[PDB]
Chain length 222, copies 4
């Protein structure tokens, strides 16, 4: 009843088909990786980056968590960021939200009293919600959900950009761009939400919060 056979057989079939189509498909990545992309996205079973962009092994390094959240104080996510930017030298960071995201719904409707770890974890979503409350007032449930997904994509794009890892990379002239994308599970389609950010100049143009003010706040003091 709890038996892995269908899955190993499926992996078997999959590996032959790929090895037939091309002889070096697997062996060329046997002993290193040089991906050009880090993807950060939701753990949601409908959203598989390698599958949805049709990539081959070695192309995209992946963080997936509930809500596609990025925070300087989550060492799980930050270590995906530091290792890829500093050691593997990836060139592009994809931050991907999706519609129908359960975390973003929970972020709207759950009472903070709710027990367990998921409720602790989605605190970041409540913080995006509260900052943008005027954009969400008097929308319909389904409408506010959709807006919450998009607002969350933008906040997280901001946190990637404001992260020590990225700020440092840019400061030593390493090329690195950050992309805000969103996925529709019901159609299989990706849409670009935020045009490429390649440094501070771009972020000043594309982000609604002010990255420059965030990085250089003390210049405003007398």
């Amino acid at each position: 009843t709890a038996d892995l056979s269908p899955l190993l057989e499926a992996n078997r079939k999959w590996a032959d088909e790929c090895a037939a189509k091309d002889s070096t498909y697997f062996s060329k990545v046997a002993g290193s990786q040089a991906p050009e992309y880090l993807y950060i996205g939701c753990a949601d079973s409908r959203v598989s980056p390698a599958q949805l962009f049709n990539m081959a092994p070695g192309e995209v390094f992946v963080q997936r968590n509930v809500g596609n959240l990025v925070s300087n104080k989550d060492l799980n996510c930050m270590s995906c960021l530091e290792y890829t930017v500093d050691h593997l030298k990836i060139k592009h960071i994809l931050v991907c939200g999706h519609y129908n995201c359960g975390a973003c719904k929970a972020g709207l409707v759950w009472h903070p009293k709710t027990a367990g770890v998921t409720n602790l974890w989605i605190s970041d979503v409540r913080e995006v919600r509260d900052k943008n409350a005027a954009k969400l007032h008097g929308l319909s449930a389904d409408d506010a959900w959709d807006k919450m997904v998009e607002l969350n994509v933008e906040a997280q794009v901001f946190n990637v950009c404001a992260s020590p890892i990225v700020q440092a990379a840019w400061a030593r002239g390493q090329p690195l761009s950050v992309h805000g994308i969103v996925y529709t599970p019901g159609t299989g389609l990706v849409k670009e939400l935020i045009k490429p950010i390649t440094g501070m100049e771009d972020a000043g143009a594309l982000l609604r919060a002010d990255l420059k003010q965030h990085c250089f706040f003390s210049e405003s003091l007398a």
Copy 2:
């Protein structure tokens, strides 16, 4: 400069092909998910559970982090576990490690003084390594790398079974199986390193460390 167009063309072409084959491929998961697997594996760019098991949207809920580590005190991993076991009622947890894993190499060689967050992050791999000194000392750096991989997988499976989430699911008679599997980037195949675990008895048989003593420790006192 850093345009996403080729990724977007590839996604559109992919989404098209899939829906032409099966017209409800996407639409049937437009408004919910009911995966049966939670998968915990490595952020590594050569290891996509969706594509190596050939699964479709809505089948596997995925956590990916550096070194496929499971810890009670990582809210990021733990909320994936809580949400999939308590809300989505998944049935199987695949804990997957892989040969040539950079995190298991670093855990063998880096000096704890090393700066940055990946070094903090991989302390769990040092702890598994230290407990297992006698199985690793004196192997070639290469044989020990492969041994570290396997030991880590086994340690993480124990962490899954010992977690508050899996423990509470079991105690209330919710069916839930845990699996240790390892993947070879050079061949695209998955071996089952540890046979299915469905509760406390299976665990006594299948794991080197003692889960019953861990959970009911006060019984070995007086």
Copy 3:
């Protein structure tokens, strides 16, 4: 070289004096505790709640961290909160900040690129600062340092009231008050910066940010 003898002499001399004064000073708390206060304040070496409130062993349960920060996703602070509210049934939570706090200075001036863990840790202070730009921009670096302190205290009080722990205690009618106080290392005095908060109504009156909307956000939708 680095002998502890003078600390040990001082401890023995102290313990002696106290028990000579009151012979059950220690022995009455030998086997349990029943403090009425949880105190959350700064790791700073000039701020000891026990001695500035002149309290004896068994009266105040203490969390101290860099910048007196309270977050749902810090298991270290949260377990102090959970254990004291749910197991010891404390009655009052003192959230205490202090002038000349290094963490609130760093949060004003450091560039997010700065290396190391204190910089990650103090992201919460940047977030309070960014929300409050209009109260800080253009003050002298010194007036703004003092303003940051107060704003942080107020933010942390809100975090305490908004936490799952305090929310659940309140909803089950457990009496629990939250207090904002700030301390002046130069004078040894404590001012009460925010008046007692004992539940949702007091909070509506006493805090700038909106706790009711935060907790019952889905009501402002349709």
Copy 4:
């Protein structure tokens, strides 16, 4: 009923008494701190470092948490460590456990299934327990409790020593010692458990786990 008056009045009385005894007691630390000690200890209301060593403001920088736990992946504790060692340049680190510690009891007797954050948090204690299970088998409840306190003091002393912050400090010849102490709440007395550790040489002599093996594991590979 929820009223801070007794406490402010008490702080008032305390501040005058100290200002009378010495005119510069407070004012000498108004605008900086130069403590020689970081103390890491339990949040338990019976254990107040400034009070128990009879210290004046500015003498001891303090982390307090449930169980006096030190972990590379807790940024609360690590940021107390990094800021004090790197910025303030403290000379001595005190790691203090105490008997009758509730965390260490919970670490022995709780089942992992237990809900809430404290149970997540004390996972470190279960990990010390399991590693030392042979030392705890067939002792009486009260006996195993006492032993668990002492074992935990030694593990945490080890984690301070093995931490990136300390390893790095020692590696650039910064003087820094680490001390394992324990406190008896029922007597007010401290006892030195582990003699001063000032570098690797000392740790090889005083610690039961092998710090050198932990730091230089790869030297053992062929």
